[PDB]
Design an enzyme around this catalytic site. Structure first.
Site, short mmCIF file in Angstrom:
data_model
loop_
_atom_site.label_atom_id
_atom_site.label_comp_id
_atom_site.label_asym_id
_atom_site.label_seq_id
_atom_site.Cartn_x
_atom_site.Cartn_y
_atom_site.Cartn_z
N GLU A 119 0.88 -1.17 0.00
CA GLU A 119 0.00 0.00 0.00
C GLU A 119 0.92 1.22 0.00
O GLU A 119 1.80 1.31 -0.87
CB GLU A 119 -0.99 -0.08 1.15
N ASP A 120 0.76 2.16 0.92
CA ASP A 120 1.60 3.35 0.97
C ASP A 120 2.63 3.30 2.10
O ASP A 120 3.26 4.31 2.38
CB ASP A 120 0.74 4.60 1.12
N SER A 121 2.83 2.14 2.72
CA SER A 121 3.72 2.09 3.87
C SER A 121 5.18 2.19 3.46
O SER A 121 5.53 2.17 2.27
CB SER A 121 3.48 0.81 4.66
N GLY B 57 3.13 8.17 3.47
CA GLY B 57 3.10 6.82 4.01
C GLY B 57 3.49 6.72 5.46
O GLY B 57 4.32 7.48 5.95
N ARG C 263 0.09 6.47 -9.69
CA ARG C 263 0.21 7.87 -9.31
C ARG C 263 1.08 8.66 -10.28
O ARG C 263 0.96 9.88 -10.34
CB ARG C 263 0.76 7.97 -7.89
#
Ligand SMILES: [Mg+2]
Ligand SMILES: [Zn+2]
Ligand SMILES: [Zn+2]
Ligand SMILES: [Zn+2]
Lengths: 49, 49, 192, 477, 44, 115, 254, 240, 34, 66
Positions: D204-206, D343, D375
């Site tokens: 994900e965005d971590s 993140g 993105r």
RNA sequence: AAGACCAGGCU
């Protein structure tokens, strides 16, 4: 801020060089809060005598 | 005497006007601080165009 | 668990080499963009000499815009197809798109080939100034560059006018995202 | 127009517009009009010449400045509705010269196209290589990036002040950051970032972080909380007094330790203060006594940094107390690049567990590749490559938006001269087993920002706590 | 109580209910000295 | 505020057994070793040494959760050979190799220093 | 069915750096050795800090953090010292800590740099390594810094201040003969300093029967321990860990 | 006026009867943890210490509950309150009160939330009934909620500053209801479009493709490692 | 006399001079002073 | 504020090299030559001295308490 | 105590 009319929020052509196109807040104030361009200057006014 | 008017920082009537880096440092004022805000009851207030 | 622990061996990444294409692919893309702009110029000249015949049920402006949009969309699709064909089997963009994890063929096309036309309210970029889009263009200019067609890609970088037109394009999406939620929630509540 | 350019009797404030078709001539001296400077173009040639640039380059000890440039008729202020009659050239060297001409009646020229961006958008490297929503996200998140906000922060008594231990100026910079003073007060750290899927904790965005770097002071910071307290009178003998209570001789029966207060009822600086500790013992004589003493914010677990006693407008005793706590980055803390890639920290691995190059370099930050394809933040990759080139070259890279003298092929050619793969890829070894990773991972230094949002300020739990007076329901907040 | 002055750094001897002005200079800002009791830090 | 102390990575909290041996009922002659307060440094070593034994049919290790400091090793051997013996033999072989490596490194250092 | 018979060549040996080659051993052995180089090597670092007066512009735990990151010469006594958790005494003694004292005041007009040279230890063996000088803090005239510090024994798992190493270079199979990595374009990759092939060819031919067999090392010391003794201490520590497992597993079998 | 009190949102009816603030609820940031099951949730120790569950004393569990009461509110696992049959509430958090620590059948011990508890987990835009599913508590260090990544798409959550709500049922009956009705595995297939809601996402999906190509050949040690990470594996190595 | 593609130096010199004279908050200070 | 004791990535001490780096830059060395002379080979240590901002000098301008 | 305004975050 409650007006759902999109027109005043959109990035108008006449903002070129005057108002930053990238920098606006998210949420209910998108396009309604605008930041000044680097070289933009606001006129102070003078008398037309 | 008719009243007191709040003064915008680093304006022509502010006490920091025309001071140099050494003077501002002696006054514990950051030279990089642009001013342009008011101090009301200890808080800093900025008028939005 | 097992497939993450296997991915510990092979690894996955993304980089600049995943977004740079071949010099022949670049030449093909430039040639396609050139013929497309020449075709739009020919259509504009036909309308200028009043040689364009209006499609039934549609105004002259409507058919002119339809033809120009058709040409530009065909150009963008051809360039995207060429860019996708130029991809190697090792390209991480392809590895991500094919598996369906994230991204898409239009994302690859915009990254490598052509960002494409920018639209405001489902229409080509309007005339915020009297008869022109920006003070850099001449009045009554219906060409692709003046009306918001982004010739460059993200990898190559955008010119200042294309950058501003892309900001205008993204502003519409942001506004729609910010606005639709209240109506959708009110409909959901009334249904429930 | 001649008089305005000669500044003779018309101020450069004044805008003049001739609408030929409608036969109108409009002159505005009104205030509030937004305008920007532009270079005047006469015929096909700029009026700005080499002597002007020479004098401006010797600006020091020559009393020649922008006002002298304006007085020479070289630059002119133009507002929005005068632009309708203006023919602007994007650059002189590429639109003034003769071609199969688009236009020949150019009347003005932009100073530089990058001047269309704001203060927060001028810190973005390669903003023309990104998607506009991501530029907006970065413009919004830059106001939340932590750093040294003002140099004299030790004098200021402010609530909720965040300061960073080791700010660094970016290795990849925009030409306009010099005028934003970003070198003097940086808001982030250059960090070795690897774009790879390592263990699934960066999905994900971590972000995966290096724990050894964090132990060395990486993205460590300090939070200052300020507390105001006022001695006052209201009634004929109702008054507030700073004094050290006896715990059981006042109306506020609670368990908290009053032992830390001094004779005047104020904790001296340097005393560790935890939850429920009474920083200011203030008693209000009950016409017994009522305890209006102030406590710390729960679990703030800080140390008293500064205590100040003054007299207010009226003249009563007034006290300010500043408490500090150090905050080492944790899992829940929020980190962001200059491209909209935000993140939290999924997990922290020590240096032993991080992947390493042949030279022993381990990335400080590892981010998932899936953040890139949708993105479409290519400026992030270009920044990472330019920074890798710059750290070896010893120069600071130029990422000003619209400079044609920088492109990805040239950066790759420069990087290939230092013994690295020209596209930035590098062979990484598995930290756990030491085996090579089959794919070659994109690595390099990128400027990263720590954000104001931390998990310690957001975690909350409730079980039969305070109850609202009117609804008899749980409190809000 | 020992109160460092905010402008001239002279310490003042001063007590409860005294109006705050520095003895040397009349300035109205005072700072409490760091306490004497010791606090132990880890070098982590 | 919820951060565990730095020493749970490497130090037993008192009552924990460093090693725990559990029979695996799924397959005959299979055992499961639980090593407390250890990490990849030791598990990878033991697994690599175990894979060299011709009488070992299965050998693998894992960390059940990175935030916990625990190793699980599964060893399956041939019918006439005990996984306990395989584990002890692997450890002894590793110690012997490390001792020989240490001695040769010291000899190399001494030869390098006096030419 | 048995241990390797590995051999060591040492190529470069200086006061900062040790390049050596380990042949005929497993890859897991080499990875665990390079990992122990970082995380299991004991060294001495400042751990307990008490500040008496700090009128500098840096706060108390900022200075304590910097003090903790200052390397201390750990060559002699780190074998002699106990861990504090293992020491028999209740409170700091020479068998489990080293005392440092700092007392600096800036009376002179020009700014004084408080450096590691100003740290004074109770014993001569454990001076800060830089004795240019590691800068602790700068002092204006009238500013003061007095503190006490006790140093204990630990290793890199606890905190990175107990990391003895300034990066370990590690590499095997410089010519990609085992194909553990796959180059999409082999001609674009610079050759390793250990490559044994001509300038014309990019990779060695694929070897299906090969296994990783030479490990190239480069251990760079931070100054606390000599790079020659870092490797020896790491080997001894790994051997001790394996022996502790052997002992307790023999007990568990019993 | 009274009309204004009752009329709008945050008025009595909508703001305090149709919806209201509740007890035994927690909120914090969510972070990924691929080592958890799809029905498990990672819970910080501080939240699990604050949150409590009332449990009825029986002859089976009286010893364990007495051990928890002895631990009290200081040590992590113990009790916070003891409720007598008469409804009197004994608080263990301030004082040892050793005469009151006696337990008998019928009492209620409010223990701290432990591993295996059932909790409703929610993300606030709450658009469909898969936005609130029951999870199983596992206790982890640090201060973030942890969940499997396949569960993210039901909640529409991403780990970019997202916080999620945790509701703890306080009765055995409602615990049975959540277990039998709203558990995550029971909500895999939605009745909305008769499709599965959870799927394989992100790295794993790309790795799935790369893993399942023909060219993937795995050596012996790699196979043994991958089999070590199988939970349903029967223990027999397939013939290569 | 023309700047012969030294333009990258020239334009940033004039921009430096502009921001050295005015700065960033001139609209605030000028408005309040007037 | 002030130069970090350790490089964050690898752990090399860069805290004793700021003054020498400033001296070299004053002695007309370029940044690359000065970094090479100081012995900072890999970019992780180089970025430390190259991107450092010394705010402690600005903090020392303000007069202190006592 | 409460009310008001403002700013920000996640969809
Ligand atoms: Mg989100
Ligand atoms: Zn005074
Ligand atoms: Zn001792
Ligand atoms: Zn380094």
């Amino acid at each position: 801020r409650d007006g759902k009319l999109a027109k005043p929020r959109q990035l108008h052509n006449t903002l070129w060089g005057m108002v930053c196109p990238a920098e606006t807040p998210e949420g209910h104030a998108v396009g309604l809060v605008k930041n000044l361009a680097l070289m933009a200057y606001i006129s102070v006014g003078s008398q037309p005598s | 005497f008719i009243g007191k008017i709040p003064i915008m920082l680093r304006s022509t009537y502010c006490l920091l006007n025309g001071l140099t880096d050494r003077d501002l440092c002696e006054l514990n004022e950051c030279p990089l601080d642009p001013g342009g805000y008011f101090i009301i009851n200890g808080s800093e207030k900025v008028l939005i165009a | 668990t097992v497939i993450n622990n296997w991915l510990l061996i092979e690894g996955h990444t993304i980089g600049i080499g995943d977004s740079i294409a071949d010099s022949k692919t670049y030449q093909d893309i430039q040639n396609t963009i050139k013929k497309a702009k020449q075709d739009v110029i020919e259509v504009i000249e036909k309308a200028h000499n009043n040689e364009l015949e209006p499609t039934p049920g549609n105004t002259l402006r409507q058919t002119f815009e339809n033809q120009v949009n058709r040409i530009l969309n065909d150009a963008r699709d051809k360039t995207g197809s060429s860019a996708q064909k130029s991809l190697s089997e090792y390209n991480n963009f392809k590895s991500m798109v094919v598996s369906g994890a994230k991204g898409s063929k239009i994302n690859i096309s915009q990254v490598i080939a052509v960002v494409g036309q920018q639209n405001v309210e489902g229409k080509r970029i309007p005339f915020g100034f009297k008869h022109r889009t920006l003070p850099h263009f001449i009045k009554d200019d219906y060409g692709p560059e003046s009306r918001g067609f982004v010739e460059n890609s993200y990898l190559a970088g955008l010119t200042p006018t294309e950058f501003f037109f892309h900001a205008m394009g993204g502003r519409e999406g942001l506004i729609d995202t910010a606005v639709k939620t209240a109506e959708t929630g009110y409909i959901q509540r009334r249904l429930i | 127009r001649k008089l305005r350019r000669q500044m003779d009797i018309i101020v450069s404030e004044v805008s003049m517009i001739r609408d030929i078709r409608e036969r109108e001539i409009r002159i505005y001296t009104d205030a509030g009009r937004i305008c920007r400077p532009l270079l005047i173009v006469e015929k096909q040639k700029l009026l700005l010449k080499k002597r002007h640039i020479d004098q401006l380059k010797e600006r020091e000890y020559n009393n020649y400045s922008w006002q002298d440039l304006v007085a020479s008729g070289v630059v002119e202020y133009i507002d929005t509705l005068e632009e309708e009659t203006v023919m602007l050239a994007m650059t002189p060297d590429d639109l003034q010269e003769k071609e199969v001409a688009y236009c020949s009646t150019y009347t003005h020229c932009e100073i530089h196209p990058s001047m269309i961006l704001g203060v927060c958008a001028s810190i973005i490297p390669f903003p023309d290589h990104n998607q506009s929503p991501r530029n907006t996200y970065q413009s919004a998140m830059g106001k939340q990036a932590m750093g040294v906000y003002i140099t004299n922060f030790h004098v200021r008594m402010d609530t909720l002040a965040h300061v960073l231990y080791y700010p660094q100026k970016p290795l990849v910079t925009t030409r306009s950051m010099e005028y934003l003073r970003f070198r003097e007060l940086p808001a982030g750290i250059n960090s070795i970032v690897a774009i790879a899927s390592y263990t699934g904790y960066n999905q994900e965005d971590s972000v995966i972080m290096n724990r050894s770097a964090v132990d060395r002071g990486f993205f460590r910071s300090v939070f200052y909380r300020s507390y105001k307290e006022q001695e006052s009178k209201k009634g004929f003998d109702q008054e507030e007094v700073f004094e050290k209570p006896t715990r059981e001789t006042c109306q506020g029966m609670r368990h908290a330790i009053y032992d830390k207060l001094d004779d005047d009822g104020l904790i001296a600086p340097g005393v560790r203060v935890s939850g429920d500790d009474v920083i200011i013992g203030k008693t209000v004589t009950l016409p017994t006594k009522r305890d209006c003493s102030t406590f710390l914010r729960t679990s703030e677990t800080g140390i008293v940094d500064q205590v100040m006693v003054t007299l207010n407008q009226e003249g009563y005793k007034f006290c300010k107390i500043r408490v500090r706590s150090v905050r080492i980055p944790q899992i829940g803390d929020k980190f962001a690049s200059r491209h909209g890639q935000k993140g939290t920290c999924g997990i922290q691995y020590r240096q032993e567990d991080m992947p390493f190059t042949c030279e022993g370099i381990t990335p400080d930050i590892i981010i998932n590749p899936h953040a890139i394809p949708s993105r479409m933040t290519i400026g992030h990759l270009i920044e990472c490559l330019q920074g890798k080139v710059s750290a070896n070259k010893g120069e600071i890279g130029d990422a000003t938006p619209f400079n044609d003298a920088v492109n990805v092929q040239k950066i790759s050619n420069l990087l290939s001269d230092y013994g690295y793969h020209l596209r930035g890829n590098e062979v990484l070894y598995n930290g756990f087993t030491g085996r090579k990773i089959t794919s070659q991972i994109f690595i390099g230094p990128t400027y990263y920002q720590r954000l104001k949002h931390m998990v310690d300020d957001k975690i909350h739990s409730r079980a039969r706590g305070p109850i609202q007076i009117l609804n008899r329901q749980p409190m809000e907040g | 109580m020992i109160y460092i002055c905010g402008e001239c750094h002279t310490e003042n001897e001063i007590k409860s209910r005294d109006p705050i002005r520095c003895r040397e200079c009349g300035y109205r800002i005072m700072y409490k000295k760091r306490t004497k009791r010791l606090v132990v830090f880890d070098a982590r | 505020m919820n951060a565990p102390p730095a020493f749970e990575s490497f130090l037993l909290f008192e009552g924990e057994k460093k090693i725990t041996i559990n029979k695996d009922t799924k397959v005959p002659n299979a055992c499961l070793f639980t090593i407390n307060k250890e990490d990849h440094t030791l598990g990878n070593i033991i697994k690599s040494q175990l894979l060299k034994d011709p009488q070992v049919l299965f050998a693998g290790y894992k960390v059940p959760h990175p935030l916990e400091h625990k190793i699980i090793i599964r060893v399956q051997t041939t019918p006439d050979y005990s996984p306990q013996e395989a584990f002890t033999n692997a450890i002894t072989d590793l110690i012997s190799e490390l001792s020989l490596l240490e001695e040769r490194f010291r000899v190399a250092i001494k030869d390098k220093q006096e030419g | 069915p048995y241990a390797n018979q590995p051999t060591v060549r040492i190529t470069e040996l200086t006061d900062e750096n040790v390049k050596f080659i380990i042949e005929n051993t497993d890859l897991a052995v080499a990875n665990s050795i390079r990992r122990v180089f970082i995380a299991e090597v004991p060294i001495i670092a400042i751990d307990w800090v008490q500040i008496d007066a700090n009128s500098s512009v840096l706060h108390d735990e900022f200075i304590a953090h910097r003090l903790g990151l200052i390397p201390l010469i750990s060559d002699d006594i780190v074998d002699k010292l106990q861990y504090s958790r293992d020491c028999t005494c209740e409170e700091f003694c020479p068998e489990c800590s080293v005392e440092f004292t700092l007392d600096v005041r800036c009376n002179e007009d020009q700014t004084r740099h408080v450096t590691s040279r100003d740290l004074i230890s109770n014993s001569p063996r454990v001076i800060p390594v830089t004795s240019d000088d590691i800068l602790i803090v700068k002092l204006r005239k009238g500013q003061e810094l007095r503190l006490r510090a006790y140093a204990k024994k630990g290793f890199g798992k606890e905190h990175a201040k107990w990391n003895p190493t300034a990066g370990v270079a590690f590499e095997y199979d410089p010519d990609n003969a085992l194909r553990h990595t796959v180059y999409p374009k082999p001609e674009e990759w610079p050759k390793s300093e250990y490559s044994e092939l001509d300038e014309d060819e990019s990779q060695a031919p694929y070897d299906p029967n090969g296994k990783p067999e030479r490990f190239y090392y480069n251990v760079e010391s931070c100054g606390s321990l000599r790079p020659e003794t870092i490797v020896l201490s790491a080997l001894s520590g790994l051997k001790k860990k394996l022996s502790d497992l052997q002992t307790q597993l023999s007990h568990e079998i019993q | 006026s009274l009309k204004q009190r009752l009329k709008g949102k945050e008025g009595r009816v909508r703001g305090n009867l149709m919806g209201k603030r509740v007890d035994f609820s927690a909120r914090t940031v969510i972070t990924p943890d691929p080592n958890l099951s799809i029905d498990q949730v990672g819970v910080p120790r501080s939240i699990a210490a604050n949150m409590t569950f009332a449990e009825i004393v029986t002859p089976f569990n009286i010893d364990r509950l007495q051990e928890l009461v002895r631990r009290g509110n200081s040590q992590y696992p113990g009790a916070k309150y003891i409720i007598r049959d008469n409804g009197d509430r004994i608080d263990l958090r301030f004082h040892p009160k050793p005469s009151d620590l006696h337990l008998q059948t019928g009492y209620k011990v409010e223990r701290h939330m432990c591993d295996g508890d059932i909790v409703i987990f929610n993300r606030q835009p709450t658009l469909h009934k898969m936005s609130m599913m029951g999870h199983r508590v596992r206790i982890l260090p640090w201060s973030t909620f942890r969940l499997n990544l396949s569960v993210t798409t039901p909640y529409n959550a991403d780990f970019d500053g997202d916080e999620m709500n945790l509701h703890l049922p306080q009765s055995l009956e409602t615990r049975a209801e959540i277990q039998e009705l709203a558990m995550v595995p029971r909500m895999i297939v939605t009745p909305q479009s008769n499709r599965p809601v959870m799927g394989i996402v992100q790295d794993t999906l790309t790795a799935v493709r790369k893993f399942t190509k023909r060219d993937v050949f795995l050596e012996r040690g790699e196979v043994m490692n991958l089999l070590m990470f199988l939970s349903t594996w029967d223990g027999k190595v397939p013939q290569p | 006399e023309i700047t012969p593609d030294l333009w990258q130096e020239a334009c940033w010199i004039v921009i430096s001079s502009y921001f050295d004279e005015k700065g960033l908050v001139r609209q605030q200070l000028d408005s309040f002073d007037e | 504020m002030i130069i970090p004791v350790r490089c964050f990535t690898c752990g090399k001490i860069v805290g004793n090299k700021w003054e020498a780096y400033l001296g070299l830059l004053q002695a007309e060395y370029t940044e690359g030559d000065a970094l090479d002379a100081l012995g900072l080979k890999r970019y992780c240590c180089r970025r430390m001295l190259l991107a450092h901002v010394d705010l402690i000098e600005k903090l020392l301008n303000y007069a202190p308490l006592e």
